[PDB]
């Protein structure tokens, strides 16, 4: 078997500005096989109100999905996307780069 | 119109762990899911409101029955593949069928299978044959190629039926699928590592996702490394992307979207 | 490869009934059709795969059970005369593959009647060739008549000297109605067997017409004075001259 | 959606017959022909989904997708080709739509016609040995029964003949039995 | 101001089939001509029309006839096509004839192939092959290859499409097709084409490349009796996307 | 009556070519030259009827009635001059006699040759392996395949107009298992310095 | 040989009477018609038996096609002329082309046109130009001279082709064209002396009267050379007598290299 | 339009002699345009069996033709040629002058 670890991209819906309402996206793609766990984190803790698309199919036989939540960025808060997959020994925590 | 496509995927998993359906099937028009079915619900459902509002319940009922048959066929085909390979444990089987209606009026059609995420069998509707990747796929190719009528049925389905269904769904969802949201585009400059200036050309808010971005020097094409960002969904039905270069004398970002060209000259 | 039962059945209005169908071809899809004069086959119910079933075009008054991959039963809940028809079970390897054809069972003739009081077996008679035919054509035609039977559930055949024949035989495709103005007319059916004149002139040649009739079974009740019109074989014979 | 084929066709033994089938469907996934002899099950004959003509022995099947039309062609017709022929189209949802079937009747090639009406006894009248162009009419009333034409086929003599039977419980004699039909002039009445 | 317009560009025929070639000129010329061109020999006149209302035979009139329908139109008729009539047919016109110095003006040509039976007519199989990474690093250029193989007769038009528009710069398609089996007279053909772009153009992942082959083949009226699909006039294509990594 | 011209001529980009046409006719009412690009209509180039040389751009046409001879002269050859050139003579009855045509082949001037054989990427839709011999000098000739299951096309000249860059190339392909780019063009005489990148 | 010539004529009529052809073309070798074509028959046909006997049917078929083309062209050209003259009614258009092979071997060549029987355009094959007689002709001259290749074509046809065809027909008709029938010449009185010649071929003949061995010029009446009907010709010349003084008159006839003198006693 | 009137000459094929068969010629030339009507007269009556050459073309663009008929001259019979043309307001008769 060839297993492919997920690409993980974290980015806001609109260009980020502190104090302005926005949405935080985590796009997880290119993985195989399909079992995946994704959470969005604020300051290390799981966010509860998280929308996500269904598992989606690429022409190259890998999979993708989108997780997102409404948020208002601040200089103090730290957001991340946490992903587990059979290719990873431990869950991977990918930090939002603050639209830099 | 622009280029549009209709495609259906199937995913079969043997001995799935808790929470993974044994069989899933999803349909797409362009980048939008339109239908879904899996071995847990055992029901085919719309994934877009313009499919639901335009297709009677008899439709969903009929293809629920067909998908139950296709699930069972997928289960047995996966079992025979594992026997061919002498494989135990969990493995995956996938199918993709579909067609494209090009801007110029030409069409394409495709039908392909994969085993454990890798190309397994590829149908060529223009020659009515299957391309096999190895001896096991070759054994399946010989069986499928011995049914001449089924090869003719497949060619007909890809070339005529799939296209007609696509034009039907294109009209159902025309307010979504045929709209145009032009990109908002900006250029940022920044000194990074001492003496190294980075130029980022960033676009967001655009639909359809197809977008062309490039950097040009003095009005001619770059020869240096251009970094491309993926075309990413923003969550609101629009997309975003970027391209960047390292400035070394007159640089401009060039964007094309839905027949409109844009130029952003760096000061 | 599709085995369907019963071949014939008489039912009274309101009676229940199950038709059996099994296929041993490892097919996944099975179908139940009815065939009525003047129209194309109409699907009653189908089963695209083991474990699922759905209605076809005319589901009312019927139900089905896909008992397993091989078998697909058709149930008549409370039989109505509108369900008098010929039923066909069919199967195919899958469904929704385009070019796969159907394989059909042999058919089941069902007649639903308000009561059984008009059911009769046929009277069978054999008529010997005329001597005028023998001298004019050097050929001899035998004629069999099955008459007065109801419903139209008969099969006629010919036997000479113990063995059955097919050549030189033609049987009417459909019976005629002895009382064409009656909704419950009884039926008559004719068949000819032509042989060489010298063959008929040999007294060692024994000829017999046989009509198999499909009527009532033993579970059916019979209160009338005449003999119960059960499934039976009526025959008439003629010796060579 | 609809599918149309002629109710009945009649052709002469040894000749050729073409059975048409037209269809108006939302979508198309193939056209099937089945043969169904009287009292038996239909059996698969042919499938076409792309344009052309496929031959299988004496039978060939043709499809034009643009005209929405197929035909079944039988050449060198034999008596045993007498049957119903059913056309069915698989639609956009893979459902079959069935035509009501074409009954095909084969007229034998009568070499030496010898029309005659014979009386048998054991009380029936046999009209036989007339040429295939002669048609038999129904009875004038009840208590007198006249069957349809029927082609007999003797193998060891390579001889076929038409016949019809008439009988009555009522007066009735073979002289006036078939008087309701257009009988050949030279018909023999013993 | 279209010059000389003749149709059709391509046609496959069965032995014994009829065919009319059309020709019109909008130059108000008086004289029209029908020629056939064959390998290894000069153009040969079939029939000509010195003026409206008159026609006469050329050097090779047998198997053909013509009609000068009006001043503009001069049609060529093959009543019963023969394999020897496989050729490229050219209509031409001139202001007058027998006039000395006036030149001919030619139509685009009509390529006819006449076959005993349509059993060996095949559309092309089209495949596209992406550039070698070693080429990209050695030359900073990227050559894509398109292969159209197994087609017969040689009635094809190959084109390259970049981001949905046809391109000609950087393209070279073989001028003559290859016979896949040179010994057999009815051999099927192969054709190759290249499109070469800069490495930076190939390395943009949103650039789309398509190789398209128009095949001219059978139509509705042609009878088909083979098991394979009817080889109708059709477009066969194959595609590639640019590659970043 | 006959008219004759060479079947084919090959010259180098930038140079000069003279295409000859000789004719034997009872009478003479003029000699025409036509240009015909492959797959296209002939178009009129020139007419001569008296003796001498007539200029028209980079092309001039010469005629000697007494010798029954004409030539078409092409100066400063460009790749677009690749075409067939048809000579035709109008005879005593004003009927044209056509020569069989001369195919003119033009060798490009390759400024910086870099001969190489590259393995292209397999297509998931085809069983063929494809090799490209490219960037060789115009003196190199590409031989046809000696193996019946290997196909090699003739050399082709492509022009990258934006960069004013021309290159020769030939394509070889096969679905045989023992087919490798290292040996695809073994039957041709290829430059000693041809670059064969390492496989795998 | 003697001088010989070949020439082709065309006549176009813009509004001809009923049955009269709108187009006629006749060829001649010397004074002999050799070919004819008109818009009624639409066929090119021989007019001399030595042409018929020597040119196969494919020749008459070819030039029949060409003449149908030339007929239409002539109609177009006459239509344009009468439009530019702004003329109503019926008008005529004429062409003459041909060549001569002279005794000494030199050649001449000519081509010209007429409108209503008057010179319209005359080709000069040495300066390669057209002489125009008026401004309608001048407009046509500009158009024709813009086509230098066509001028070169006509020079070559006049100097080379026409002469080659002439030699070919001359051979075809040699028994007719190259024979000599010398004249029968007599003198009678009518008061003037009439010198009469007949039965001669070719038609070219020189007759004159001499007075006391000197050639009177403006005193001689010259008859026309006239066809007799049988292929030979006749002619005459007369001179008026002076009744006041005697003179020795003599008739002088020159024909095909032979000189004859008839002294009147 | 300069129209040119026909020149008309009448004469026998051979020097005439009474009672000897001959041909009476009428040669009409130099006229333009080409339409012309010619009759030969015997005693003022139009001769029936009269032949004529095809219309012929001269260098100077005018036309000519020869009309003729076989005859035997006598001392009493007078012969003539009658010609009509657009240039002539009435037919012009030229008698045969022996
Ligand atoms: C209207 C329609 C719906 C279909 N839905 C699915 C589907 O949900 N999954 C799948 O894998 N294939 C599908 N197919 C292709 C069958 O061959 C469909 C075909 C048609 C014509
Ligand atoms: C053999 C021959 C025949 C011709 N017949 C005619 C003719 O009938 N009328 C005419 O006006 N001109 C003619 N031409 C001269 C063309 O310029 C001819 C030229 C040639 C070479
Ligand atoms: Na893990
Ligand atoms: Na012909």
Residue numbers in the entry:
A (entry chain F): 0 to 99
B (entry chain C): 0 to 247, 252 to 270
C (entry chain E): 3 to 243
D (entry chain D): 2 to 123, 130 to 177, 179 to 198
E (entry chain H): 1 to 245
F (entry chain G): 2 to 201
G (entry chain A): 0 to 189, 196 to 270
H (entry chain B): 0 to 97
Task: Reproduce text from the manuscript describing this model.
The major histocompatibility complex class I–related (MR1) protein captures and presents small organic molecules to an innate-like T cell population called mucosal-associated invariant T (MAIT) cells. MR1 is ubiquitously expressed in all cells, but its cell surface expression is dependent on ligand availability. The release of MR1 from the ER to the cell surface involves a conformational change driven by a molecular switch involving a lysine residue (Lys-43) at the base of the ligand-binding groove. Here, we report that RF catabolites, including 10-formylmethylflavin (FMF), lumichrome, lumiflavin, and alloxazine, bind to MR1 with moderate affinity, while RF itself binds weakly.
Crystallization of MR1 binary structures is challenging, so we used the MAIT A-F7 TCR to aid crystallization. In the crystal structures of MR1-FMF and MR1-lumiflavin, the flavin rings of both FMF and lumiflavin ligands had the same orientation as for RF and as such were involved in a similar network of interactions. The acetyl moiety in FMF adopted two conformations in the pocket. This acetyl moiety allowed the formation of an H-bond with MR1-Arg94, as well as water-mediated interactions with the α2 residues Tyr152, Gln153, and Trp156. Here, the lack of ribityl tail in both FMF and lumiflavin disfavored the formation of “direct” hydrogen bonding with MR1-α2 residues. This shows clearly that RF catabolites are well positioned within the MR1 A′-pocket, allowing the stabilization of MR1 in the ER and reduced trafficking to the cell surface. Although lumiflavin and FMF have a very similar chemical structure, they did not form this flavin bond and exhibited markedly different binding modes and contacts within the MR1 A′-pocket, with their isoalloxazine rings rotated ∼90° relative to lumichrome and positioned closer to the MR1 α1 helix compared with the lumichrome, highlighting the malleability in the MR1 A′ and its ability to accommodate related molecules in highly distinct orientations. The RF catabolites FMF, lumichrome, and alloxazine, but not RF or lumiflavin, also increased the total level of folded MR1. The RF catabolites described here were incapable of Schiff base formation, and we observed that while they could bind ER-resident MR1, this MR1 did not egress from the ER, likely a result of the failure to neutralize Lys-43, and instead caused a retention of MR1 in the ER, which in turn drove downregulation of surface MR1.
